[PDB]
Amino acid sequence: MCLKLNLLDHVFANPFMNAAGVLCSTEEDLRCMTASSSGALVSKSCTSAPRDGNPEPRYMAFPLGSINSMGLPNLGFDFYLKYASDLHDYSKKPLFLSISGLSVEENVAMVRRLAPVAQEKGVLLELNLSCPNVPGKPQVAYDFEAMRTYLQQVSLAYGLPFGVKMPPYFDIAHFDTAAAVLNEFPLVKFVTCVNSVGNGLVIDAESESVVIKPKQGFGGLGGKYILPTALANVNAFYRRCPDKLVFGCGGVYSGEDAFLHILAGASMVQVGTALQEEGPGIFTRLEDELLEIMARKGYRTLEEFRGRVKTIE
Amino acid sequence: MCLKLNLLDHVFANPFMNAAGVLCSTEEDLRCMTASSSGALVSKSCTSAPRDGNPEPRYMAFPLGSINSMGLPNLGFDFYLKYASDLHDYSKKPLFLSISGLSVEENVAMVRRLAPVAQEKGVLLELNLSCPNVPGKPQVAYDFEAMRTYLQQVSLAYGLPFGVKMPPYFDIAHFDTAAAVLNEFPLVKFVTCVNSVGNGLVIDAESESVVIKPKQGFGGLGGKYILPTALANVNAFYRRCPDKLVFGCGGVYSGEDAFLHILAGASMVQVGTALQEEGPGIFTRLEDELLEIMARKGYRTLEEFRGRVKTIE
Numbered sequence: 001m002c003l004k005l006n007l008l009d010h011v012f013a014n015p016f017m018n019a020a021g022v023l024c025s026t027e028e029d030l031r032c033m034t035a036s037s038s039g040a041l042v043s044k045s046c047t048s049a050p051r052d053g054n055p056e057p058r059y060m061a062f063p064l065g066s067i068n069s070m071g072l073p074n075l076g077f078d079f080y081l082k083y084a085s086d087l088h089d090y091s092k093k094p095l096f097l098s099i100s101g102l103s104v105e106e107n108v109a110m111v112r113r114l115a116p117v118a119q120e121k122g123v124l125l126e127l128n129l130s131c132p133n134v135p136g137k138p139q140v141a142y143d144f145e146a147m148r149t150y151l152q153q154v155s156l157a158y159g160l161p162f163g164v165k166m167p168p169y170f171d172i173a174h175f176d177t178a179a180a181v182l183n184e185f186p187l188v189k190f191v192t193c194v195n196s197v198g199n200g201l202v203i204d205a206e207s208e209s210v211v212i213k214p215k216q217g218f219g220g221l222g223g224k225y226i227l228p229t230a231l232a233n234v235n236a237f238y239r240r241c242p243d244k245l246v247f248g249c250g251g252v253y254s255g256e257d258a259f260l261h262i263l264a265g266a267s268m269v270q271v272g273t274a275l276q277e278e279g280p281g282i283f284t285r286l287e288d289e290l291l292e293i294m295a296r297k298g299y300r301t302l303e304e305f306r307g308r309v310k311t312i313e
Numbered sequence: 314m315c316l317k318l319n320l321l322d323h324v325f326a327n328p329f330m331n332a333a334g335v336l337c338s339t340e341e342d343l344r345c346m347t348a349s350s351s352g353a354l355v356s357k358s359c360t361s362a363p364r365d366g367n368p369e370p371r372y373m374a375f376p377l378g379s380i381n382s383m384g385l386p387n388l389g390f391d392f393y394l395k396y397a398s399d400l401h402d403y404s405k406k407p408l409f410l411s412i413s414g415l416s417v418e419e420n421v422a423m424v425r426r427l428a429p430v431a432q433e434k435g436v437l438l439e440l441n442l443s444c445p446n447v448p449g450k451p452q453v454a455y456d457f458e459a460m461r462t463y464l465q466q467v468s469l470a471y472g473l474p475f476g477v478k479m480p481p482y483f484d485i486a487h488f489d490t491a492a493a494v495l496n497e498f499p500l501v502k503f504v505t506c507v508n509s510v511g512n513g514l515v516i517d518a519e520s521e522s523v524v525i526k527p528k529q530g531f532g533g534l535g536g537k538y539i540l541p542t543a544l545a546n547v548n549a550f551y552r553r554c555p556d557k558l559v560f561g562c563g564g565v566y567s568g569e570d571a572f573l574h575i576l577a578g579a580s581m582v583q584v585g586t587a588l589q590e591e592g593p594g595i596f597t598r599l600e601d602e603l604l605e606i607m608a609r610k611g612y613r614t615l616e617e618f619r620g621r622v623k624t625i626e
């Protein structure tokens with residue numbers, strides 16, 4: 001019985017990894033993720049220049065999940081490119097590098113310089129499209145014309161297989177349109193579903209106050225709130241993009257939740273809120289828990305059940 | 314100490330009512346809601362002709378909420394219009410009728426017939442701007458030009474104050490656009506935020522199956538999963554639509570949850586999943602709980618805290 005996978009010309013001990021943003025901003029964080037039992041890691045979504053992000057408090061967690069308006073804090077592209085080129089030990093596990101430029105030109109600038117390190121070292125690009133562009137316009141992946149432009153320019157600039165981090169969608173027409181945009185780009189080899197459920201609002205009853213400072217308390221939701229949303233997106237893109245991989249992200253706290261993601265179509269399974277809350281020991285727990293469900297069911301490998309969710313009649 | 318309020322030229326014993334679709338389809342259901350302690354009731358969204366809806370199972374509930382793809386089952390507009398005009402006891406509480414025609418023309422035809430009953434009896438119109446999926450196009454409230462058409466045509470055809478049931482939005486630009494549409498229409502006097510979080514997917518681990526039959530298991534989410542989404546929409550439209558009332562719906566299981574909705578800006582507070590699961594007894598509990606939290610805080614009226622959620626400076 002085993003959790004091994006072989007995809008994107010890399011070998012993974014198990015499907016688990018951090019979600020971009022969690023335990024991945026500093027060298028210390030990336031060393032910690034590398035030392036963990038995860039099957040891979042992704043570095044913090046970066047911009048060309050370092051960012052301090054938004055004022056605190058900017059993340060808060062609760063029994064059913066988390067809310068954040070971090071402001072994209074990160075150490076800048078050059079730091080994560082150096083980590084990929086010179087510091088990461090690729091004998092331990094594969095590395096993804098997430099980029100999240102605030103314009104198409106910023107993305108292009110970065111991926112031009114990532115390319116030779118991807119080619120030589122095998123770091124894998126995740127492009128965040130659940131990202132602001134022009135204020136007053138929707139985020140990139142909710143603006144299909146912008147999304148197409150970003151994908152065309154990054155495809156041309158980078159020229160190697162990459163993946164994309166998607167926001168959740170809520171309307172069948174959007175699933176259809178979004179997947180058709182993605183399927184225009186052969187270099188998009190994996191699709192990570194999902195980024196946060198956007199612009200939720202947590203209010204504390206005792207204090208009568210919102211719980212984060214930026215955006216008058218509005219921020220993106222993760223955790224137990226979003227697992228059925230996550231599963232729907234994984235399965236919608238799994239069905240619509242038969243020549244791509246889907247990676248699942250949202251609401252994973254247990255091996256059971258991972259099993260559901262995988263039944264929906266997930267290859268890799270990313271862990272955000274739960275990892276932020278529990279720390280990197282979560283990965284040995286998730287592995288044990290998933291193996292125990294597999295043993296009970298008689299499944300020996302992940303491919304035996306991946307995408308095999310049953311529908312009714 | 315009592316929770317009685319006046320809105321829309323009606324008096325309400327308390328801000329609670331059912332959410333459209335729950336406990337409101339049949340004459341029996343409407344009589345049960347009328348006999349309850351709720352401050353108001355709303356009828357099942359209707360079409361011009363009766364509908365069977367989708368195959369069963371089409372609703373399921375879980376500790377964190379519910380999923381549904383009912384398919385707009387309803388007894389038809391003539392039945393609900395007769396209920397409003399002949400059967401409802403207005404001395405007990407106000408009645409809202411929800412309309413959800415499958416085209417603008419169908420909505421116009423229903424509202425032209427409702428108008429004189431509204432004038433004579435004081436029934437209130439809630440226009441549902443959510444739709445079965447049509448391939449190649451989004452739900453009406455996610456297509457802003459379609460929404461503007463619907464509202465223009467209904468406003469002209471009806472000519473009296475009405476409200477609109479909205480799906481959740483997840484993007485700040487979308488809140489700005491949606492609210493600007495709604496503010497073009499002076500007759501839209503209340504906005505109900507929110508309908509279900511669209512097209513989630515619940516999967517059962519043991520059976521490895523989806524839990525509802527229609528739409529390959531996809532359906533709208535309610536209950537605990539959606540409370541921060543609901544609060545965000547309530548507050549976003551409360552801030553954007555100062556000349557309208559906002560009715561909150563989503564995630565209410567307790568008086569504290571109602572208190573959060575009202576802090577965010579809600580005038581009435583609708584109860585869907587929790588009502589389906591607990592039954593109409595829930596209304597007495599919710600009242601008791603809300604009054605208890607008001608007493609502990611020193612609030613004597615709802616106006617004292619409605620929309621007064623605090624932000625961090």
Ligand SMILES: Cc1cc2nc3c(=O)[nH]c(=O)nc-3n(C[C@H](O)[C@H](O)[C@H](O)COP(=O)(O)O)c2cc1C
Nearest residue numbers: 019020021045194195196222223250251271272273
């Ligand atoms: C503190 C925090 C920071 C985040 N930063 C990013 C980011 O920089 N890039 C990105 O793609 N997603 C980011 N996300 C989103 C997560 O990658 C993930 O998509 C989301 O939290 C849902 O997964 P979960 O339910 O496991 O939390 C962040 C999430 C959190 C909680």
Ligand SMILES: Cc1cc2nc3c(=O)[nH]c(=O)nc-3n(C[C@H](O)[C@H](O)[C@H](O)COP(=O)(O)O)c2cc1C
Nearest residue numbers: 332333334358507508509535536563564584585586
């Ligand atoms: C079984 C069921 C049927 C529903 N039917 C409708 C409907 O006919 N019209 C409508 O406006 N909303 C309908 N809804 C949505 C609810 O009114 C409500 O917006 C949603 O369930 C979120 O509230 P909750 O978290 O309290 O469940 C339905 C919900 C359920 C669970």
Ligand SMILES: COc1ccccc1CCc1c(C(=O)O)[nH]c(=O)[nH]c1=O
Nearest residue numbers: 068069070071072073130131132196220
């Ligand atoms: C400036 O970057 C923003 C701002 C608001 C919302 C989302 C982003 C992109 C970065 C990001 C953030 C973030 O830094 O707020 N949080 C997430 O949950 N996911 C993300 O992808």
Ligand SMILES: COc1ccccc1CCc1c(C(=O)O)[nH]c(=O)[nH]c1=O
Nearest residue numbers: 382383384385386443444445508509533
């Ligand atoms: C989201 O509304 C839909 C979805 C599919 C088919 C019909 C509708 C409108 C009626 C409705 C339904 C429904 O009858 O399925 N369920 C909801 O949660 N909200 C509704 O407003």
